[PDB]
Each structure stands twice: as structure tokens, then as C-alpha cells.
Amino acid sequence: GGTILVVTGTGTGVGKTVVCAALASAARQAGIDVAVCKPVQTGTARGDDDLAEVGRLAGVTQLAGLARYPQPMAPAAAAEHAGMALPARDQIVRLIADLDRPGRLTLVEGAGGLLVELAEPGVTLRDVAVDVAAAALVVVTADLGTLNHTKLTLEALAAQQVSCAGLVIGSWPDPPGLVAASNRSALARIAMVRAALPAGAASLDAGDFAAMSAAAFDRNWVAGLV
Amino acid sequence: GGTILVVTGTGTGVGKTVVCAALASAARQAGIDVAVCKPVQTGTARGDDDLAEVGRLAGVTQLAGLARYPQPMAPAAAAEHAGMALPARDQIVRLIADLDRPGRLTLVEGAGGLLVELAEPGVTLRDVAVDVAAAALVVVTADLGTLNHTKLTLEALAAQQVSCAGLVIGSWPDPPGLVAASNRSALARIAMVRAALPAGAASLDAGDFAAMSAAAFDRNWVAGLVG
Numbered sequence: 127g128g129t130i131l132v133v134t135g136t137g138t139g140v141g142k143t144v145v146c147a148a149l150a151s152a153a154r155q156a157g158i159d160v161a162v163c164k165p166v167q168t169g170t171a172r173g174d175d176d177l178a179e180v181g182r183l184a185g186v187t188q189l190a191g192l193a194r195y196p197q198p199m200a201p202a203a204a205a206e207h208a209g210m211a212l213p214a215r216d217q218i219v220r221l222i223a224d225l226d227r228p229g230r231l232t233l234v235e236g237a238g239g240l241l242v243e244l245a246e247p248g249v250t251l252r253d254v255a256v257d258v259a260a261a262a263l264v265v266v267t268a269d270l271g272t273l274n275h276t277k278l279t280l281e282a283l284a285a286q287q288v289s290c291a292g293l294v295i296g297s298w299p300d301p302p303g304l305v306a307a308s309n310r311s312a313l314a315r316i317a318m319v320r321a322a323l324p325a326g327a328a329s330l331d332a333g334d335f336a337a338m339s340a341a342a343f344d345r346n347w348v349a350g351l352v
Numbered sequence: 353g354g355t356i357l358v359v360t361g362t363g364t365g366v367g368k369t370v371v372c373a374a375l376a377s378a379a380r381q382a383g384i385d386v387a388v389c390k391p392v393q394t395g396t397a398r399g400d401d402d403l404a405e406v407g408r409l410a411g412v413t414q415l416a417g418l419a420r421y422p423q424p425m426a427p428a429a430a431a432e433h434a435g436m437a438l439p440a441r442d443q444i445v446r447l448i449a450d451l452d453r454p455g456r457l458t459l460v461e462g463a464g465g466l467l468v469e470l471a472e473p474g475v476t477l478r479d480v481a482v483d484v485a486a487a488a489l490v491v492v493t494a495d496l497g498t499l500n501h502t503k504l505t506l507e508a509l510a511a512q513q514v515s516c517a518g519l520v521i522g523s524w525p526d527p528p529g530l531v532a533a534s535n536r537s538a539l540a541r542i543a544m545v546r547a548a549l550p551a552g553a554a555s556l557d558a559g560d561f562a563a564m565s566a567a568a569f570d571r572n573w574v575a576g577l578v579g
């Protein structure tokens with residue numbers, strides 16, 4: 127059908143959701159129909175709803191999820207705290223495949239890092255990304271330690287023949303700092319860096335956001351995702 | 353030869369140095385000769401000296417450095433910034449081989465986290481552990497996101513057939529919360545949790561530290577490391 131990208135990250139709180147929303151905006155503005163699948167969502171007591179933040183920030187309406195867990199833990203932990211299983215792997219891949227269609231960028235968002243359990247039994251976002259012939263975008267920080275997490279994540283993909291559509295620095299500080307400029311350049315030798323989102327971007331109104339996302343990415347790479 | 357252990361971590365700041373000293377201390381108390389080596393050491397310009405810190409807390413005398421750099425950054429960076437070079441793969445491996453004796457436990461403390469470049473080009477503590485046929489002791493946190501990071505690390509050890517010697521939680525809070533509880537239990541399900549050192553164990557004095565260490569590790573596991 128169309129193009130299916132999983133948006134993973136080297137960890138929690140590296141900015142997967144804001145980057146998701148940002149690539150989603152950029153894609154829309156390039157005239158691409160965007161869907162966003164978020165199979166499992168946790169932290170729903172705190173008020174977390176990444177599907178909502180993407181609809182709010184980038185205007186996506188095709189916004190698909192299966193399970194919502196109140197506790198702010200990895201899925202498995204929050205499902206065990208609820209007394210409730212996790213969606214089956216079948217539900218996720220079938221959901222994502224229904225979602226996919228030609229001319230549609232379907233973004234697939236996981237929870238935490240690449241190898242966290244999403245479905246039972248023991249299924250990760252890496253597995254889901256295999257079952258739907260999806261490539262992976264990797265959201266990374268600029269903090270001390272990010273190259274190792276990146277290489278680990280980049281290796282865990284290659285080990286399953288999951289393509290790496292590249293990195294995004296979820297949060298770019300102002301001003302950078304020695305460690306941030308150094309990592310940004312070192313990340314660049316490791317893989318193609320597609321964008322570095324200015325810090326605090328997740329609090330912008332939908333207009334400001336669409337500007338930042340318009341600029342942050344590269345017009346040609348975006349448009350060439352058809 | 354004897355037993356070589358690389359001590360690595362899911363990243364930086366997870367307790368590698370103190371775990372090195374704790375295994376080292378407990379091993380000494382088990383009658384085991386111990387050397388420790390820090391092939392790459394950054395942060396010297398702010399007094400970072402992990403060999404010295406291991407000598408302090410555990411009393412190991414046999415300490416071997418090799419590359420030292422001022423800035424508190426990854427070795428590739430601290431070396432570009434001081435105009436200096438990264439040591440060569442075979443110089444690291446040589447520093448370790450010179451320490452390896454039968455009956456000796458040799459600990460090789462890494463520089464933040466398993467895939468960090470220690471030597472040009474892209475030479476990691478993993479490649480070293482292959483060269484010297486070492487097992488890897490993986491230092492972890494109990495914090496959020498530690499599962500993913502630990503699995504990625506083990507997965508990277510297993511892809512080069514570097515045997516995992518188990519995990520150590522470098523700082524273990526008292527009392528632990530729901531998330532610390534869930535991770536320690538979840539962690540124990542993917543690999544052997546050799547220990548969970550108490551928080552701030554780095555501020556214990558010689559006596560307290562050795563008591564902590566001996567308590568933290570299964571004496572039979574420690575003694576089983578070198579025959």
C-alpha cells in the first residue's frame with residue numbers, strides 16, 4: 127500500500143511523541159495524508175494522550191490506538207498493575223495494516239525504547255516493524271551517553287533487518303553546549319540526522335508548531351516518503 | 353591464564369566504578385588476587401580517577417591506567433579536544449594481557465557504556481572482550497527505561513558471543529517504589545542480578561565499604577569466578 131514508519135527512541139522522554147507530531151505536520155504540509163497508530167498508551171491518570179497531542183499539534187485525524195493504561199510505566203508493568211492483559215500482536219499488525227493505504231504516511235508510535243514489551247507474548251515495536259515491512263526512525267537526545275544508546279538501538283534494528291530511516295534529536299537545547307555540539311556531529315557520522323527539534327516545541331500552538339516542523343525537516347526527504 | 357571481567361553499563365552514571373570496587377572488595381575477602389584496569393579514563397581535569405576511587409574504597413593495589421584525558425566527555429571527544437589520540441586496540445588488549453595471571457581476577461572498567469568508542473576506529477569494550485575472551489558484567493539502574501537499555505546491551509553482548517556474567521544494580525534506594533520494584537523484578541527475569549548495591553555506598557569508609565561489598569554478593573558466586 128503506502129509507507130509505514132515506526133517512530134522509536136533510545137528511551138523514555140526523548141521526544142518520540144513531539145517528533146511524531148512534527149514529522150506528521152511536515153508530511154501533511156507536503157500534501158501527504160498522514161495516519162498515526164499508537165497501539166498502547168500509558169500514563170492516562172496523569173493525563174497523557176500522545177494521540178491527542180499529535181492531533182492537537184499537527185492536525186492528524188486518523189489516530190488509532192488499542193489500549194490505554196492509567197499507570198505511568200512501561201506497558202507490561204501498567205497492564206499487570208491493572209489486572210489486564212496487553213493487546214495481542216495480531217490486533218496491532220492488523221490495525222496498522224488496515225490503517226495503511228497508498229499515498230498515506232502511517233506513523234507507528236511505540237512506548238519507551240525499541241525493545242519494550244508492547245503486546246503479548248513478549249512482542250516489541252521491533253517485531254511489529256518487521257511484520258509490516260516498516261522502516262524505523264530513531265529519536266535521540268543530545269545528552270552525554272546518547273551515542274551508545276543510539277548505536278545499541280541502531281544495532282538492534284539491523285539485527286532484525288529493520289531499516290533505519292534515520293535519527294531526530296527530539297530536543298535541541300539553546301544554547302547547545304560542548305557535549306551537545308559534539309554529540310550532534312558524532313550522531314551525524316553514525317546515521318542521517320533528519321531534524322533537531324528546538325527545545326520546548328511541544329508547547330507551541332498549532333500554527334507555530336507547523337512552522338517549526340516545516341523548517342526542521344528537509345522538504346525533499348519528506349516528500350520522497352510517498 | 354586467569355579470569356578477566358569487563359565491567360560495563362547501560363550507560364554513563366549507572367555505578368560502574370563503585371560496582372567494580374565492590375566486586376573487587378568482595379573478591380579480595382574471598383582470598384582472590386585482584387587487579388583493576390581503566391584502559392580509557394576521561395574527566396581528569398575535574399579530578400575523575402576511577403582507579404584511585406577503586407583503590408580507596410576496596411584497597412586494591414594493582415591498578416593500571418593507559419589513556420588519560422581532561423574533559424568529562426566520551427573518549428573520542430575528550431581526545432579530539434585535547435589534541436591527543438585514542439589508544440590503539442592492541443594497546444588496550446596488551447594492558448589487560450599483562451595483568452592476567454592464573455588465580456587472579458582482572459576487572460576492566462569501561463568508559464560509560466558498552467558501545468563507547470575506546471580506540472580507533474570504533475573499537476568498543478565489546479571488541480576488547482572478544483580479543484581477551486572476557487565475560488561482561490553489566491551495571492544497570494532500577495530507573496524507568498532500564499529494561500529496554502539492559503536488553504539492548506545484553507543483545508549487543510550476545511551478538512559477538514561475549515558471555516554475560518550477570519547484572520548489578522549500581523544504586524538501590526531504600527525503600528524502593530513501585531517502579532524500582534517492578535524493574536528489579538523484571539530485570540531478574542532477563543538475567544542474573546548478581547547484586548544491588550545500596551545508594552551512596554560510594555561514601556562508605558574502608559570498613560563499611562568492605563562490609564557492604566561482602567554482603568552484596570553471593571560469596572559462592574564470587575569464589576566461583578576464578579579457579
Ligand SMILES: O=C(O)C[C@@H]1CCC[C@H]1C(=O)c1ccccc1O
Nearest residue numbers: 138139169198199200237238496497
Ligand atoms: O512513552 C513514553 O516513553 C513516556 C511514557 C509515559 C509513562 C511512562 C513512559 C513510558 O512509556 C515507558 C517508561 C519506562 C519504560 C518503558 C516505557 O514505555
Ligand SMILES: O=C(O)C[C@@H]1CCC[C@H]1C(=O)c1ccccc1O
Nearest residue numbers: 271364365395424425426463464468
Ligand atoms: O565512565 C563514565 O560513564 C563516567 C564518565 C565521567 C565523565 C564522562 C563519563 C564517561 O566516561 C562517558 C560518558 C558518555 C560517553 C562515554 C563516556 O566514557
Ligand SMILES: Nc1ccn([C@@H]2O[C@H](CO)[C@@H](O)[C@H]2O)c(=O)n1
Nearest residue numbers: 139141296297323324326327328
Ligand atoms: N523538541 C521537544 C522535545 C521534547 N519536548 C518535551 O519532552 C516531553 C516528552 O517527555 C514533551 O511532552 C515535551 O514537554 C519538548 O518540549 N520539545
